[PDB]
Design a protein around this nucleic acid. Structure first.
Ligand SMILES: O=C(O)c1cnc2ccccc2n1
Ligand SMILES: *C(=O)c1cnc2ccccc2n1
Lengths: 10, 8
DNA sequence: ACGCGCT
DNA sequence: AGCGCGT
């Protein structure tokens, strides 16, 4: 995720 | 991702 | 003293 | 496996 906590997605 | 001072 | 989080 | 950090 994020970044952070990429995306989702990308 | 770990949170020990900042937790990202 | 340290890794988490889905589309 | 490389992203996102500071008490
Ligand atoms: O803010 C917080 C923080 C800062 N530095 C660190 C270094 C190593 C392990 C954990 C750490 N946590
Ligand atoms: C969390 O799992 C994690 C891992 N590496 C990092 C590098 C820089 C900032 C934050 C981070 N968080």
């Amino acid at each position: 995720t994020x970044p952070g906590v990429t995306x989702p997605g990308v | 991702x770990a949170x020990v001072x900042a937790x990202v």
